[PDB]
RNA sequence: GAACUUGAGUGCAGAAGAGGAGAGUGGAAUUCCACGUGUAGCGGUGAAAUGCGUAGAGAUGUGGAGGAACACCAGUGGCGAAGGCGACUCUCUGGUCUGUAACUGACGCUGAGGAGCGAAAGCGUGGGGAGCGAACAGGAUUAGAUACCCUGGUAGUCCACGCCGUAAACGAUGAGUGCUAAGUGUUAGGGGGUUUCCGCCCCUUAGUGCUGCAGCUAACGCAUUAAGCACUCCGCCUGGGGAGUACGGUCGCAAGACUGAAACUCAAAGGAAUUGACGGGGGCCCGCACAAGCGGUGGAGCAUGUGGUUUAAUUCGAAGCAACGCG
């Protein structure tokens, strides 16, 4: 079998980043990159406006707050259901951060996902936020089950 | 291995030889088996009899 | 005091560590269940590490610094508890691996699946 | 009737052995007890709970009591007819093996019936009770759980004597003897070729393992420790069930043991080995199989197909995957 790897497209016409196009490919509903690019640039323009910074640094700061160090996988021996803590390799750190941004942004509920994703980035920047519930709860699950490694 | 008692020609092991028995007894206090000390069957039997009698006169330990 | 002996008793459920005084006077004690783990997590060597940490914290009041650790009971948490006494500010000099060995003695209770 | 010494045994000399019986002693540990340390748990499980615990437990130090088995030696090692026998010492005592040459000179072997020994459980009497532990109680799992799991715990396990006299009491292989390739460990001897030795080699016993030739066998395998080739003696089998039953008898405090059918019933029961399939057996591998994800179905409305039911007919065909927007 063995591991297979994938690719992704380098630029964005505003905000020339790899990972911002990685978020563009994320949150795509039904094969519509156009709607996700419009939502994304209107959200990052809100993040540039409402806080007087470039939204790249706010976005990476939010990522740094969300990216979990420790997943806790499963290892069932007998009838035990043990969970085993896993040091996450940083690709999965970035992709779990992007899933949690996208999922809890559209799960929040405001008068566009422009505003929802923008306010979720603004909350994950000033660390208290909705995806950071998942960050904290995964680190608490790894902290309690640290006896197995 | 090689036997000790065949080498020095010595017969009945004579419990009074506390230093020789102290050589055969292990570090914790146990008797070392025949594949460690290299003796015969007969000489290992007389060795273990010797060590048990010398234990009952406190010439040899039980536990250390 | 400055010197004492650390009795670790790690059995298949619990790893109880009591740091006592040389003619047997317990300065402080903590178990794997005393730390809070109630389930099967009592058996993990992390709880033995935590129990050695708490016993080390309790021992350094009126105090003591250089231990002499006696491993008792057939378990798992002996190595982590010896290492965790070192990393909690104490010194572990001798290691007496003394589990109570009967020669022949009493007969054990029956094997389990029968 | 007379001789002989090989078979058998005595004599002398060693050697090894948990061979047995009686008495005495030891060291761990388990439990219990008292005191010091000290505080909130302990214990246990797949998960928990009953239990133990602030009235001070679990841990720990010292001391004491009591019972039972004797770690390491320990080994397809030893001994015994078998059961069996593992600390040590003494008292008495059984057998074996080795070297012969001193003796006897066939004195030998087997053995129905008889006599004895005879694991464990059980029985009687008196003690004993630490651990374990039927029965029994509580908690769990569970549809049920008179079970497995956990916490307790009676008889018993222990000792003295008496009874029972049974086991997969097994090497599933009666005892004796002779003959019939080897290799190799090992247990206890003996002897040789150099070395006083150490040690190596060789030879020979008696015991004990494995691999192996002829031979045997249905095959697996055994093979000088035979399941080979022979002789002696004994026990036992003559299809499965009924049935080790019933009756009678002997023994037994009892439980039961031994001896032991028939009516009836079946055309099989069975052994060893092959090919498959299966395993809540092991290994290795692979598939959107699992995981990692994305979107759904199951909820609502309708389309469509199928089961039931109503029918005059609701035409017939498909029915787990592999029928059900199928012909």
From Swiss-Prot, chain A:
Its function, per the record, reads: One of the primary rRNA binding proteins, it binds directly to 16S rRNA where it nucleates assembly of the head domain of the 30S subunit. Is located at the subunit interface close to the decoding center, probably blocks exit of the E-site tRNA.
Q: Which organism is it from?
A: Bacillus subtilis (strain 168)
Q: Which residues form a coiled coil?
A: none
**Organism phylogeny:** Bacteria, Bacillati, Bacillota, Bacilli, Bacillales
Q: What is this protein called?
A: Small ribosomal subunit protein uS7
Q: Which Gene Ontology cellular-component terms appear in the entry? A: cytosolic small ribosomal subunit; ribosome
The cross-references to Pfam families, in alphabetical order and at most eight, read: Ribosomal_S7 (PF00177)
Q: Does the keyword tRNA-binding apply?
A: yes
Q: Name one GO molecular function term.
A: mRNA binding
Record keywords: Ribonucleoprotein, Ribosomal protein, RNA-binding, rRNA-binding, tRNA-binding
SUBUNIT field: Part of the 30S ribosomal subunit. Contacts proteins S9 and S11. Interacts with VmlR.
Which GO biological process entries does UniProt record here? Answer: ribosomal small subunit assembly; translation
From Swiss-Prot, chain B:
Q: Is Ribonucleoprotein tagged as a keyword?
A: yes
Q: Does the keyword Isomerase apply?
A: no
Which GO biological process entries does UniProt record here? translation
Q: What triggers or suppresses the expression of this protein? A: Strongly expressed during exponential growth, decreases 2-4-fold in stationary phase, part of the rpsF-ssbA-rpsR operon. The operon is induced by DNA damage by mitomycin C.
- Extract the GO molecular function terms from the UniProt entry: small ribosomal subunit rRNA binding; structural constituent of ribosome
Q: Which GO terms describe its cellular component?
A: cytosolic small ribosomal subunit
Function, as annotated, reads: Binds as a heterodimer with protein bS6 to the central domain of the 16S rRNA, where it helps stabilize the platform of the 30S subunit.
What name appears for this protein in its UniProt entry? Small ribosomal subunit protein bS18
Gene name in the database record:
rpsR
Q: Which residues of the full protein are shown?
A: 14 to 77 of 79
From Swiss-Prot, chain C:
Q: Which GO terms describe its molecular function?
A: rRNA binding; structural constituent of ribosome
User: In its keyword annotation, does this UniProt entry include rRNA-binding?
Assistant: yes
List, alphabetically, the InterPro entries matched: Ribosomal_uS11 (IPR001971), Ribosomal_uS11_bac-type (IPR019981), Ribosomal_uS11_CS (IPR018102), Ribosomal_uS11_sf (IPR036967)
Give one Pfam hit by family name: Ribosomal_S11
Q: Which GO terms describe its cellular component?
A: cytosolic small ribosomal subunit
Instruction: Give the UniProt record's GO annotations in the biological process aspect.
Output: translation
Q: Print the keywords alphabetically.
A: Ribonucleoprotein, Ribosomal protein, RNA-binding, rRNA-binding
Q: Which SUPFAM superfamilies match?
A: Translational machinery components (SSF53137)
Q: How does it assemble?
A: Part of the 30S ribosomal subunit. Interacts with proteins S7 and S18. Binds to IF-3. Interacts with VmlR. Interacts with BrxC.
- Which family does the UniProt entry place this protein in? Belongs to the universal ribosomal protein uS11 family.
What is the annotated role of this protein in its UniProt record?
A: Located on the platform of the 30S subunit, it bridges several disparate RNA helices of the 16S rRNA. Forms part of the Shine-Dalgarno cleft in the 70S ribosome.
- Designated name of the protein: Small ribosomal subunit protein uS11
This protein's encoding gene: rpsK
């Amino acid at each position: 079998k063995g591991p297979v790897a994938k690719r992704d497209v380098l630029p964005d016409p505003i905000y020339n980043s790899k990972l911002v196009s990685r978020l563009i490919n994320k949150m795509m509903i039904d094969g519509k990159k156009g709607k996700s690019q419009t939502i994304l640039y209107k959200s990052f323009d809100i993040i540039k406006e409402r806080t007087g910074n470039d939204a790249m640094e706010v976005f990476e700061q939010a990522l740094k707050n969300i990216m979990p160090v420790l997943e806790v996988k499963a290892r069932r021996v007998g009838g035990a259901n043990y969970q085993v803590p896993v040091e996450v390799r940083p690709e999965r750190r970035t992709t779990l951060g992007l899933r949690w941004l996208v999922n809890y942004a559209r799960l929040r509920g405001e008068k566009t996902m422009e505003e929802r994703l923008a306010n979720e980035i603004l909350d994950a920047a000033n660390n208290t936020g909705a995806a950071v519930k998942k960050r904290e709860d995964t680190h608490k699950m790894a902290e309690a089950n640290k006896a197995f490694a | 291995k090689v036997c000790y008692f065949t080498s020095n020609g010595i017969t009945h092991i004579d419990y009074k030889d506390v230093d020789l028995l102290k050589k055969f007894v292990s570090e914790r206090g146990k008797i070392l088996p025949r594949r460690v000390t290299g003796t015969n069957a007969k000489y290992q039997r007389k060795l273990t009899a010797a060590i048990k009698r010398a234990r009952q006169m406190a010439l040899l330990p039980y536990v250390s | 005091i400055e010197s004492g002996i650390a009795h670790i008793r790690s059995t298949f459920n619990n790893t109880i560590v009591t740091i006592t005084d040389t003619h047997g006077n317990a300065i402080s004690w903590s178990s794997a269940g005393a730390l809070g783990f109630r389930g099967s997590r009592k058996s993990t060597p992390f709880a033995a590490q935590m129990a050695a940490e708490t016993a080390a914290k309790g021992s350094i009041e009126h105090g003591l610094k250089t231990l002499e650790v006696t491993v008792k009971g057939p378990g798992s948490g002996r190595e982590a508890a010896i290492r965790a006494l070192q990393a909690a500010g104490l010194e572990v000099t001798a290691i007496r691996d003394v589990t109570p060995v009967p020669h022949n003695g009493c007969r054990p209770p029956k094997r389990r699946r029968v």
